Design a protein around this ligand. Structure first.
Ligand SMILES: [Cu+2]
Ligand SMILES: [Cu+2]
Ligand SMILES: [Cu+2]
Ligand SMILES: [Cu+2]
Ligand SMILES: [Cu+2]
Ligand SMILES: [Cu+2]
Lengths: 467, 467
């Protein structure tokens, strides 16, 4: 006579959802096979005085129900004052922590803050190495990204980026082009520790929200050095190994790095109307530069298809599209050539922004979140990744963030997050015919989510190759 | 072919669930017709240093989806150290805040702290008056309860309780009886304010946990005055008006109060084998005593059936049962006589206990929670409230707390809360055949939940008449 919600869960598989809660100050794991929250953690319990739990990624576990490990970072300072919420906190913590947490089959356990171990605090995207032997974090206030060792939480390499605008004026600093410096960032304290915890290193006093390139150009973003900003977001991994790619929002480029040899090798040019690449220029053993005549649009970077045949960058605002490179040549990223642009008549405005993504296992389809300011419904675009065309767009609700996929490729699991003060939820869409199956409650402001991987292969469609 | 979860929600109707999250430091409202969280609020955002979000009740609204108001309180101090979380904040905020929040159709808005307005902080149960013109909070650390005005947040009346044991040793303080004093509490500061915020007034350093009556007896509960504790839990309301009833856990009695005339009128005796009542004695205009010759069990849950015909008190631990009084005579509570005890051959351990309940609208059935420490399954017992017998028990999961019911009587909606560190969920149970329909994720440590009522009549089976 009645509908049992267990019928719904039974179809989804034995998969563990995990998501951080931004202004909620919490992180939680959900058993998609029963509807239960498996465990949750509230960072205030651990003396965190600004627990804006931002991005996260989970290491593969042979059985997530028995144990898994993940990394979740935080933001602080003036980031608390940027959303609809009329916060009253007199001395907010500086954030930039990088928490290591273990789910032990019962509870979450805080292991340590890797930003205390390493000395390097970073507050934007978190990713796992395809070898699951490490992770990487980027930050758009300090414009630094690094890869860390999983066992020691020490930095393997760190890169710092800087902008030298042709026109020394915030309105023109990126439109009229400039030179970005890529610099090896080396520790300064005993035990090879950085002195870059919390706010140390910040060029701007908060992260740029969606459309923040207008904000920083309009002088609406305070900081000691906003003319030097490039707004690094992420370091994502070629699933085939060897390379990692850092995105830079304001100059509208990506930098391909040799992981092991600790050098940049190529610069991918984001906007439609640019060549495939810009010329990388070595200045000395630790310093490279790239000249960018004009920045046509800011962008956000997407990441690799699961076979590493394709690499994708989102242009944002001035252009809204998905730029696509042929990355088939694993030997030499300087040969990576533009092969498609995903466009739509619906993307001609300032919004929606092409935001985050997840590929199906076979690389044939992508699911892409489409972001708008309140009150326009955000939703998901379904992309044919063979022909590079939009197949379908579905309206869902306010403030769409990230997507993950069950590893059998059957269901996409997305986060809607209420701009931190209104409706939020988990959405589940089936990928066979692309229908929205409905929503689950989620009293959190997630800017991330993962399903815990089992294998290194699973990581190819997790928080490793894409954000 | 795929099952939609929307099918599950369609059946539930247009009802809004609200629950706070204890250690999560959050409160959230969920739309049972779609699965969305409508809004959530993190008290750390407002500078709360110990946001243990504890009890709540919601005022009726003609359309909860357009707007509703609720009250949610907090606990602080050594309550942060009670649960199995290895908290690191050694000197937490003191809690005892009484937050007024409005859901405005879009977001939750923090209105104010009624404890700051009135000067009275109280940390245990919150209930709404049956007229919806006010609210009540009780507290078991300071042994105070009060009824507050909804517009002004000022105290209408406050009562303080104190224990004078026959035997001056914690082992025998309650078992060997004593005299409980009931004292009218008057404002002591200008503009009609109390000096009783935060820890001011506390006799003990944390709210007694379940079985806590043993710990206090064994000298395991720190405080300046545990020998004089009664552990007030709540002040619940006669749905017929006029009367309010305070529950006292350690002496196992409830005190019935005339709300408008601001005097106690009757003391009901909890344990099986004691008379219906003990004798209330007037000492002066502000002071009553009652002699209790021995205390054979502590007790806890007290409330009314929705027609006010029956009043119930739960005995816990030494005895586990439900004591029932004939409260049909609304003119004179001193006439309220015991009519039944709900007992069960499965309730002979020290656990399960029975800490919460909800009636069906016709008063024919009760849903009651059955609490055990980890790891024994907690769940729901269904009680025939015509014959006073257990119909059924269902096992559900860890740490069951409160229950609410949809106002059409169709669905009981309950909270499981992980002891603050393991699995938590919302459970849905239909009342026609008393089958569990399943679980929804809820990353919160809830010790309370309501469905937002629309009418005064709906309030009779919400957080007004029972806990
Ligand atoms: Cu069913
Ligand atoms: Cu570790
Ligand atoms: Cu990003
Ligand atoms: Cu209680
Ligand atoms: Cu009990
Ligand atoms: Cu509680």
């Amino acid at each position: 006579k009645y509908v049992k919600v267990q019928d719904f869960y039974d179809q989804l598989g034995k998969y563990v959802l995990v998501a951080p809660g931004k202004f909620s100050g919490t992180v939680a794991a959900t058993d998609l096979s029963t509807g239960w929250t498996m465990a949750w953690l509230a960072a205030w319990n651990y003396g965190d005085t600004c627990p804006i739990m931002h991005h996260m990624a989970a290491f593969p576990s042979p059985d997530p129900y028995k144990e898994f490990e993940f990394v979740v970072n935080t933001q602080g300072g003036k980031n608390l004052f940027i959303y609809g919420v009329p916060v009253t906190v007199e001395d907010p913590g500086e954030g930039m922590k990088i928490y290591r947490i273990k789910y032990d089959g019962t509870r979450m356990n805080l292991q340590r803050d890797a930003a205390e171990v390493s000395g390097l605090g970073l507050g934007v995207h978190v990713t796992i190495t395809p070898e699951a032997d490490g992770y990487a974090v980027g930050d758009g206030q300090k414009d630094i990204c690094a890869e860390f060792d999983r066992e020691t939480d020490m930095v393997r390499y760190a890169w710092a980026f800087d902008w030298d605008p042709n026109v020394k004026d915030l309105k023109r600093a990126w439109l009229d082009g400039g030179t970005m410096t890529i610099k090896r960032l080396k520790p300064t304290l005993p035990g090879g520790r950085y002195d870059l915890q919390g706010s140390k290193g910040n060029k701007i006093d908060w992260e740029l929200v969606p459309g923040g390139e207008l904000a920083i150009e309009d002088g609406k973003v305070s900081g000691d050095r906003p003319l030097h900003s490039v707004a690094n977001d992420a370091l994502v991994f070629d699933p085939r190994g060897k390379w990692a790619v850092a995105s830079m929002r304001l100059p509208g480029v990506c930098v391909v790095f040799d992981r092991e040899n600790q050098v940049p090798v190529a610069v991918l040019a984001g906007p439609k109307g640019t060549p495939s690449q810009f010329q990388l220029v070595k200045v000395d053993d630790d310093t490279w530069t790239v000249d960018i005549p004009e920045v046509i649009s800011a962008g956000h970077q997407a990441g690799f298809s699961p076979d590493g045949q394709s690499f994708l960058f989102m242009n944002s605002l001035r252009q809204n599209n998905i730029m696509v490179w042929d990355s088939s040549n694993h030997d030499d990223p300087t040969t990576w050539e533009k092969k498609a642009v995903v466009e739509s008549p619906d993307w001609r405005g300032a919004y929606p922004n092409t935001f985050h993504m997840v590929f199906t296992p076979d690389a044939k389809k992508i699911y892409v979140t489409m972001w708008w300011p309140s009150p326009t419904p955000n939703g998901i675009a379904v992309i044919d990744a063979v022909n590079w065309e939009v197949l379908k767009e579905v309206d869902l609700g306010p403030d769409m963030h990230t997507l993950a996929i069950t590893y059998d490729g059957k269901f996409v699991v997305g986060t809607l997050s209420g701009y931190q003060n209104t409706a939020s939820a988990i959405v589940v869409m089936e990928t066979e015919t692309d229908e929205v199956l409905g929503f689950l409650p989620s009293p959190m402001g997630h800017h991330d989510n993962v399903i815990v991987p089992r294998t290194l292969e699973d990581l190819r469609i997790s928080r490793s190759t894409t954000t």
